[PDB]
Point group: C4
Chain length 454, copies 4
Amino acid sequence: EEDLRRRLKYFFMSPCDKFRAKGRKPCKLMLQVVKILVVTVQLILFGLSNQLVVTFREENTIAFRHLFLLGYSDGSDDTFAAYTQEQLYQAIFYAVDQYLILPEISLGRYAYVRALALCQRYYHRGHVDPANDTFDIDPRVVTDCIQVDPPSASYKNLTLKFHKLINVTIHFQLKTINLQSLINNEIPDCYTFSILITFDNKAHSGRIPIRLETKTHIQECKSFRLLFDVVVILTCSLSFLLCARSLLRGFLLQNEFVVFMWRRRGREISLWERLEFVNGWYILLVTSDVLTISGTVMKIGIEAKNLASYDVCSILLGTSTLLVWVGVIRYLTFFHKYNILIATLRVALPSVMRFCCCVAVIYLGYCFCGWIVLGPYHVKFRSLSMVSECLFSLINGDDMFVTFAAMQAQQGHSSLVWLFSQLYLYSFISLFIYMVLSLFIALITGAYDTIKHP
Amino acid sequence: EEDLRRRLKYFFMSPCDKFRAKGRKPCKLMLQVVKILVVTVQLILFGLSNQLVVTFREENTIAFRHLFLLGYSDGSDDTFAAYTQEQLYQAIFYAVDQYLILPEISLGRYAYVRALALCQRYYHRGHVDPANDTFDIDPRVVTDCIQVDPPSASYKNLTLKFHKLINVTIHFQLKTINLQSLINNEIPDCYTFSILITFDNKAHSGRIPIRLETKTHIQECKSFRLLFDVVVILTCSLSFLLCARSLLRGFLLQNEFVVFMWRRRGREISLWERLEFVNGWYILLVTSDVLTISGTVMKIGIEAKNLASYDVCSILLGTSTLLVWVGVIRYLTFFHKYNILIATLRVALPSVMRFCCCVAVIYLGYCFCGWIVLGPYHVKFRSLSMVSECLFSLINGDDMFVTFAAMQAQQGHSSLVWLFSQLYLYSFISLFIYMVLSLFIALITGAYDTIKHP
Amino acid sequence: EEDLRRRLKYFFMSPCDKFRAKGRKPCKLMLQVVKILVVTVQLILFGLSNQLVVTFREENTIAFRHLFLLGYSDGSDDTFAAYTQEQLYQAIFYAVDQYLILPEISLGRYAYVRALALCQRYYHRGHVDPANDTFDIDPRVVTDCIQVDPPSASYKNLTLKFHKLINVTIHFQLKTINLQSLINNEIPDCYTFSILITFDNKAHSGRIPIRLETKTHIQECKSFRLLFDVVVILTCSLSFLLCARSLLRGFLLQNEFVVFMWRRRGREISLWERLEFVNGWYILLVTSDVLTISGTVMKIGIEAKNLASYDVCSILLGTSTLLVWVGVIRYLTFFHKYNILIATLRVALPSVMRFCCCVAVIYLGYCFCGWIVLGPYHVKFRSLSMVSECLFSLINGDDMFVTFAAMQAQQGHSSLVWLFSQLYLYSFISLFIYMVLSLFIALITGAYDTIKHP
Amino acid sequence: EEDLRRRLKYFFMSPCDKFRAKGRKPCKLMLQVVKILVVTVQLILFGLSNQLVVTFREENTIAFRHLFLLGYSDGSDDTFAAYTQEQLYQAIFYAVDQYLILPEISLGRYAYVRALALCQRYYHRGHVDPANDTFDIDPRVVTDCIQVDPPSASYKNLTLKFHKLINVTIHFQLKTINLQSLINNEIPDCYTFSILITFDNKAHSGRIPIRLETKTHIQECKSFRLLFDVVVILTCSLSFLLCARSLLRGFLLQNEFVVFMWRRRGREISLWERLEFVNGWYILLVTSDVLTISGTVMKIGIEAKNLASYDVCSILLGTSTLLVWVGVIRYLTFFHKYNILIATLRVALPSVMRFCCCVAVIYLGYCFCGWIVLGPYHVKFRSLSMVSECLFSLINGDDMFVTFAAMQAQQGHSSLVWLFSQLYLYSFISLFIYMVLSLFIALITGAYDTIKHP
Ligand SMILES: *[C@@H]1O[C@H](CO)[C@@H](O[C@@H]2O[C@H](CO)[C@@H](O)[C@H](O)[C@H]2NC(C)=O)[C@H](O)[C@H]1NC(C)=O
Ligand SMILES: *[C@@H]1O[C@H](CO)[C@@H](O[C@@H]2O[C@H](CO)[C@@H](O)[C@H](O)[C@H]2NC(C)=O)[C@H](O)[C@H]1NC(C)=O
Ligand SMILES: *[C@@H]1O[C@H](CO)[C@@H](O[C@@H]2O[C@H](CO)[C@@H](O)[C@H](O)[C@H]2NC(C)=O)[C@H](O)[C@H]1NC(C)=O
Ligand SMILES: *[C@@H]1O[C@H](CO)[C@@H](O[C@@H]2O[C@H](CO)[C@@H](O)[C@H](O)[C@H]2NC(C)=O)[C@H](O)[C@H]1NC(C)=O
Ligand code: NA
């Protein structure tokens, strides 16, 4: 078949060779430049909206913490607590008293929403007695709510139950108007902050942490976006059909190649020669194509009705734009100078992934060994996730002297954990910097030397 | 002997070759997968207990420091001291006054244990007189204890002896009940905190540091563990007998090989050919086997009676689990692609250990040179351990600009230590990053090239 | 042409060969040593002036912040704000009251300049009402200035408009005399500080930041420089004519080489053989020559009349001195041992720049992916510039554990961004340290091996 | 000459070959093991004395800062200053009032030494007038001392001259007794602290920094060392004569080799063959030998009379011990496996030192370019030393994100320095990590490959 050879001349032909031979063929290549530009501009333009929204969220939450938390200096979100009995009464009474006089205090136009509800939660049959070691506990949790309305004995005389206490929560809402939007020449977005001050007594340890949490329900008051957002799906869908048409030809031209080796007696050639016939780049491009058109329909559903679930939308558009940019490495491999550079990973990957298991095992071994031993006597090694972040930080070198000095300052309780800590940390750091990183260098150099000489 | 050749065909045979030839042989290999799973699950399940115990320890100790230490802001454990005469009286009197009214203050159910005992320790014949330089010192240390019982002149009128003073210690106990255990659906663990507030006057320098230390005596109040903890020793002992049986065959089949070369006149072959006959992996597996069965019997002795010595138990189980995971590199070397990767250290180790001595000497030389010279004029170089941690941190690069700026900010006392500090630090950092790390890279690359071509 | 061959013997001849053959030829080489010394001494002598000027600027600005800002502890320039209504009145009234009694307070000789003007700016028709969601806004900004003269009702009774407020600015000037100049034995420089205290209400979020800014107008009161500053331009201009004369010979001797290959039928030789004939070092030297003579005329215009625009002057002299020092690598390549070392980049540059695009794309991909996703739930990833600085810091390893712990401490809002953060950060750090840095090492080693064997 | 060949057989013979041939020759080698042990034990034993001395110095200096400085919280040595007029009067009056009542306040036995002298220094003819710009200055500095004797108008009514003020210094002495020495079972060391509180008004900027400095005059009150300190000089002198005897033989056996090539007509062989005949290790050993015997005589002169100049003594003993440890690399090169490892630097050094100049030039170029440009607008780049420490810290990677964020937070004054800062820092970091470190790796690998194959 002299035509099918001429097809395979044209199937493996680069478009540069095809342009200098045929001409008038940008029909595939113009899309994959437009699609890069259209997706990334859509990403940046959407990414500048969340700067204004999140900074107007964060500044209002800080301005709530100075108004409703007693004695709050900044940079102390974690080590802020109430320890005696009177500090908890003062922290509650200050919050409600700073709520009731809010227009004569604050600096924004914080209106009210019809309001405040105080509630404590205590065990039903609580009986704790360390002198006699007697317990008789019903674990049913009963609440005791107090209603407070804004414009003392309706609110005061609130006696807590410190011998059985779980949470004391304060819940109220505030409504305000973004005034920056008129400077940005648009229709405003009236927000609704939902504040939940939490006094936690979960561990029953006499250390009650205090924290404040907000939540916004964005809504309009009493088109460069939507025209562009149908362009980003029209381009991407047109590429989704045009690329799938090419893989459809790839499967069918593969299929009449499998036909010949039953007539030429090619002994039913296995997975190797048929992997050298289907492009792999269109796989990455089509799995970019699904994610962009999913995320933009999601974004239409965001701005229309539900201004909350930015999570799935952002995690799809960012991963789509990540996969589209790597699809420009497609263009570079048509040159005979880049073609050495891109072919350095196709031979190393079935060896460097073989070595990555041998590193991941030993790394996981030092994770389990370090976490149980240096769990109690150290602060960087509490949970297994935090051990994994600490040991992976120490490899490139982030925080060595802090991990050493935190061990030396207390020396554990006895000298056996300190003498173990010296051998543990020195052997682990000396292993992965010298003998393991070096092995990785040797593998990539040998894989490059395999590509260079032929 | 045609049978002994057929034994050596079967002795060096991989189990993959043995399964594809014989079949029905998982009898060795099923243990070393079960033993990985059983040990590590036992480790994680024991490792989650100490999270609840240690966090209930640490939160109660912080809640003691806010209640009994005068003017304690957090993050100031080391630079907390008493300097004048009245600050020490106020720091003692505040601690006892905050002890006597403890139920009307604290937030836990801290009961008392029959109580408080104040005691100061002073030299018998103390005579310090810098005007006349006269000393007449009996170094016998006499205590002066005060008994305080909880429900002023029994406690007040406590005049210290500031011209001869060693320690002022306050000792008392508190008993409480963990209430988190009922949420975790079990029998509680009544703790007993033992508090020792220490006012140290050891160096006699007018800087008395203040610190608080606790100690717990865990005891029950007035079975997924123990069934699993006999599985972890039954599996490991069965592997301890089954592996030792294999090394017993290895020594005996070695022994009748030594017999032949006295009849074949093999001239009493030395240590090389007989090292190529005994496996080394069973050595690591059997020294895992001793440590697991020692640590779990230790853990039974922990939870039954003595809830204190977690040190030896944790340092054995963690090291055992460390050696079991590295024993999965055993499995990878049966493939002819991993067999290049694992053979990169067998030839480098009698050369990279030859180079590790040449690095450890020069490193130790900069330790002794830096510690005496930059001892006084610098804060990172106090003890020799702290010099070793600082110089080893600077190699990968942790804290360079802090070590430079601490030198520049004072410039020592004169410019000779600063001009020495610049030459010391620049020559040391430039030595081990460029010329020494590079040598390590060259050694591993040459060792890989020795394995690759044959 | 036997003479033109003898010219090309002399044109490519090194001056070391030319000195050992001819002698009495330093006429080119003495300039390029003098020009290094003259430029760098001019740089250091100018660079020591700005130490005295800027430290006398910074110390006076700190001394203004302690005098005019209410409750200012150092290291808190960013988290200094006013949150309630009364804190803003106290922060304004404290600043003007500390202005009027300034000679009986301060420690310098701060005189007055005829003075203080307070001004607030508010919207004309401001109507914000979150209860009814009604707005009727004229965005014209009207000021309301108050005049205050130094030696209460002229200044007091200043009622702000908190429901429509943009800026409250305080502007005044202070004149002082540098007394360090008499110790430095010269004519003094009377400064004029121009202070602008700013109360910003741009975002309308109830968080008003406070900051103080100064500006100096240096002027003399009521010659080693200028003699040296004409030497630095006389030397550099003489090199500017002497080097351009050599490139003029280079173009003309190239031109009569292009003539021959039309008579010898050399087929109009392209860009390669004619690039091996023009020196590239004189290009760097002449673009040093333009920048030095531009910056020093600029510096004359600075010290004569306009003591403000140090920006263009410094950015030209520093870049000129940067290009002059690299012009000493010119001297080293005449030796046959350095000639291997300098020839390691001429062959790698059309391959390592080919690889730098393949790294810059993937790096830019992780920038766009990380910024939108971890924008809201993280503080290091606010703007795209700050993402680029954070991801480039993590490659060599700067701040890994802070970026991990800031993610773990809040876990976002839900676990999907945390589970995305672990995969994002681990894949990105493992990519550029192991597989990409290693590729760079392999390229430079192969480029050196290309130069070494021939 | 068959004997001189037999000498050269014995001259280049290793002692291992000489022991297995001759025997009873430890006469050279026993010294160089004893000398390592004797010097380092002398170093450690002297190095443990300065821990007790310097910590008794530092704790007393901190205890002075809490007693004599008004409002001193720790960690604030640099940002502690007095800004108004009344803060300087209160800082002086608090220091003298806390001096006069010192036994009823402090916790040590601080006696007095006959005492306190207050003194201020002001210009004689001071005339500063920014309204009229008139100056008439006599730079002669006149002091005004006040005498204060310990057991108000003798001390009060101290009117400063704020319009001409240089320093206000307070000087007094305190004597105490180290009581730790009786616990260490010895004769005590009565110290004499010399305190100099300094109020600096050098820059005349209205920011007066405050700092306290002490100085000790150690003296005894009203032998494992000295026996060992003559051993360390007896051993080292005996090696100083025994090694110089060997180099004396080396010069003389070289001399009768130069004789032969005038009779054999060897054409007066140059520096190469005569460098392959003199050992280089005895040069390092003899320059260790001078420094040890100098430093220990210095140490005798320290402990006898002058307990001050620890500078020259420590900087000689530390450098001597540095050179003695590297002299154990001498021993390793006798083995034919280490002999490849030690020979990796003899061929690289006349090439890696050729490359170190090409790096030091470009590094110095970025130092001069960065210091003038980013001098004013940045805090890490003030002096040229601090630029060199900052740029050298950024290469291995220490403090990248702090240097980037300090630039971004202010953006200079205008955007031109910020746009210059991005290009400066990115080009410099990308240059030395990728292209320059990689070049270093290639040089050491090629130098190892030159040694490996022959
Ligand atoms: C305070 O404690 C109560 C429990 O006593 C919490 O109520 C639980 O809330 C979670 C939702 O996060 C539910 O799944 C549980 O079923 C609730 N338990 C009960 C008994 O209601 C309450 O959420 C806590 N407060 C805060 C702010 O977390
Ligand atoms: C306070 O100082 C006394 C000594 O004056 C300490 O008592 C010593 O304690 C250790 C145990 O750690 C014993 O080995 C010594 O023999 C004890 N000496 C005497 C004289 O009793 C006491 O422990 C110190 N206080 C604290 C809390 O450490
Ligand atoms: C306070 O806000 C006003 C605007 O209400 C600022 O005035 C603007 O200043 C910039 C110059 O930086 C001009 O380009 C604008 O046209 C000005 N707008 C108006 C309405 O005048 C003022 O600069 C702000 N104060 C400070 C200190 O920045
Ligand atoms: C306070 O300032 C005076 C100068 O007014 C300093 O006196 C100088 O001290 C140095 C020694 O360090 C001498 O070289 C100078 O000659 C002295 N000058 C005069 C005029 O006496 C004094 O040292 C400063 N105080 C401190 C603590 O440094
Ligand atoms: Na750091």
